[PDB]
Design a protein around this ligand. Structure first.
Ligand SMILES: CCNC1=N[C@@H]2[C@@H](O)[C@H](O)[C@@H](C(F)F)O[C@@H]2S1
Ligand SMILES: CCNC1=N[C@@H]2[C@@H](O)[C@H](O)[C@@H](C(F)F)O[C@@H]2S1
Lengths: 309, 109, 117, 309
């Protein structure tokens, strides 16, 4: 019911396979359960999405998905064709089907279609064929969803992914209204909250979103995200999201710091928050100061274990 | 020590909020700056700040000698930069796009 | 092709000088920008169309490059190619005519704002 | 003797061992002879200079120096203790000798001491012991060189490594004055030309340094370096340095683009320039326009050969 874990969805140097395997070992330890693979600067995911995998690439993705299953971690594979896909072109849908088809032969059973950080303008050809941008994305997402035999877990990521990004506003947004109306009920929608990096995600904020998308969203939280500034790192606790939010969401996936080792507190504190109210009604249960102390206390011993670079 | 990571986490805390120890130093330094029988006060506050400045440098070097270089190597780039800024803050108290750019600089923005 | 890389190197040439093709193209966009009644409208669209042609030659090359067998050379420099491809789309189109970032630096940066240097 | 090759001495992501080996293959292929290992962001070269190598690190450094030797490529190991060395402390010098001792056990015979991007201010203890900044480096460099049994190739990189960095000027610099007068004749001196990234490196400007440093320098060229701008890449030919410069230098080491693959023209055109006046006595022999024609001709075949990321 609840998708809770990590999303490697930041810009910059994507994590290595050794780190990703360690992430699953840590997620399993902290009673977490999900991993969304969306590294923006890993060419086969965004920039060069059409490009198929080589033997070696296939081999390590085979081991990674294996490792995820061993550690009881849900490996959701994402792809962002949005920057250059021609939605009306059947050659483009054929490519996305072959690409996600290759990935399902690696052990993948959970996928995602991301349409975040793209210009709303459609090419000449897409404008004749599709009523709006929202329709084009949803037709492709739905055709892919059904083609992949309607997987148990399939996530959809909108262009208007936070409060701020909705034109004119969340409530009167024609795009989201299309998204919640025409996007299949078995496909979930990712939401970052009122802003990209939300200082707080009010229980009202999401209740209002769930009305337009006609479903509870999965949060792609950017609280500990640090890709937008070379000079910043975030080792603070999970703060701003009420434990009351859990019975109102289908998930929470933190997008943390680019540096894998600087995410202990980030993922530790999240798990303390998810476990404090994992049975509710549709802060009494959690305190960042307390979860922070518990996280640094365990992190401290890690600094003493000899690990050579 | 656990007290070191409490300071470490306070200096690199949250996007909209700094940790208490970080917020304390900034306020004390924001106070020393705005000032010149109130001498004994400033001097007591300028000397006690130097001690905090000095001990933060201690934790910074303590961390660099950690057994876990894997963790260290990932986040020390930040530590070194706050260490550079912390030394001169203390020492203060003691006292172009290529062909892409060429074109984009002519486009309506 | 050879001519493809010549155009490629010309765009990403030297720190004090752009290549001939890159400098030729820049001079033309700068010219177009600087410009019944007088017949110099004949030369402007003839010169705007010849430029919209060059904007499609450079962009054809880019797509070509991205389909190269050597994925190793391509992955190392394509991030640069993807930028100039985006700046030349809106140049061709020109011719045809939140919150934690803005308060950068964090704690180190906040302290720097109170320092002389 | 002339040291001509590459210097991996840029800020940013250092090259992998695989890339460094293929580089020795390209260098040997294009009749080049030297490689200076100086990654600014390789923590065991700058920041954590005091830190000794682990087994795996030693093994990888062993395999690399083996590959270097095998491809007739001189492997010159560099270290930058300047951000926080205490020149007077014999514990800091004992540490520098231990680390270079560990590196010579890896098969390294050539070395360097870089004091390039540091402040001239010395800690009170070094002021009491040394009469100037220039004496502190020279005393520590001459002790190290002698300790290492005076290696044939020993390089030294000054703080005032270019015309513009010289206080007040090149001929009147008291720092360079001391470098040329007190730095051992067997130790070589790195120079970047009139500025950091020089447009041209005049014959006259080199004669001016050669007089003050009392020797012909080794150039640490930044013509193809691109670490100072995220939107800049250099694929043009090695241009601006006369061939009349070869009989006036001990070598030319190019610090190229951070992206290993983009440096085919940087190193190719460098080979062409060197070979055009390889036996100079005291631009008619080299044409950047021409060298570029040949560098691209040979590069073009590479793009046709399948290689997977
Ligand atoms: C649906 C969410 N998708 C997003 N994509 C971007 C991420 O790559 C960043 O890490 C993040 C921010 F923290 F910088 O900004 C946005 S949110
Ligand atoms: C002997 C000279 N030492 C230098 N160190 C820096 C290098 O790390 C950079 O790659 C180069 C580039 F910015 F031009 O600038 C300087 S030149």
């Amino acid at each position: 019911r609840f998708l809770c874990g990590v999303v490697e969805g930041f810009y910059g140097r994507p994590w290595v396979m050794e780190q990703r395997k360690e992430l699953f070992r840590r997620l399993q330890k902290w009673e977490l359960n999900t991993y969304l693979y969306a590294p923006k600067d890993d060419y086969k995911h965004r920039m060069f999405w059409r490009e198929m995998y080589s033997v070696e690439e296939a081999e390590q993705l085979m081991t990674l998905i294996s490792a995820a299953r061993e550690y009881e971690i849900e490996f959701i594979y994402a792809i962002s064709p949005g920057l250059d896909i021609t939605f009306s072109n059947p050659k483009e849908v054929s490519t996305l089907k072959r690409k996600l088809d290759q990935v399902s032969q690696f052990g993948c059973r959970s996928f995602a279609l991301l349409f975040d950080d793209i210009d709303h303008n459609m090419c000449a050809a897409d404008k004749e064929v599709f009523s709006s941008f929202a329709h084009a994305q949803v037709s492709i997402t739905n055709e892919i969803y059904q083609y992949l035999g309607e997987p148990e877990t399939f996530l959809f990521c909108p262009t208007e992914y936070c409060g701020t990004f909705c034109y004119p506003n969340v409530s009167q947004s024609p795009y989201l209204r299309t998204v919640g109306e025409k996007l299949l009920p078995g496909i979930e929608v990712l939401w970052t909250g009122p802003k990209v990096v939300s200082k707080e995600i009010p229980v009202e904020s999401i209740e209002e979103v769930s009305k337009i998308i006609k479903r509870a969203p999965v949060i792609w939280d950017n609280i500990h995200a640090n890709d937008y500034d070379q000079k910043r790192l975030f080792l603070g606790p999970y703060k701003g999201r009420s434990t009351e939010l859990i019975p109102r969401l289908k998930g929470v996936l933190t997008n943390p710091n680019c540096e894998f080792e600087a995410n202990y507190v980030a993922i530790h504190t999240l798990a303390t928050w998810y476990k404090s109210n994992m049975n509710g009604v549709r802060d009494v249960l959690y305190s960042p100061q307390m979860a922070l102390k518990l996280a640094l206390t365990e992190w401290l011993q890690e600094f003493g274990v000899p690990h050579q670079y | 020590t656990l007290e070191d990571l409490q300071l470490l986490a306070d200096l690199f805390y949250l996007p909209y909020e700094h940790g208490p120890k970080g917020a304390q130093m900034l306020r004390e330094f924001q106070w020393l700056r705005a000032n010149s029988e109130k001498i004994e006060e400033w001097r007591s506050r300028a000397a006690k700040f130097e001690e905090m400045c000095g001990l933060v440098m201690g934790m910074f070097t303590r961390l660099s000698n950690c057994a876990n270089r894997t963790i260290l190597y990932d986040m020390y780039s930040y530590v070194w930069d706050i260490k550079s800024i912390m030394s001169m803050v203390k020492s203060f108290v003691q006292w172009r796009g290529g062909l892409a750019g060429e074109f984009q600089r002519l486009l309506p923005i």
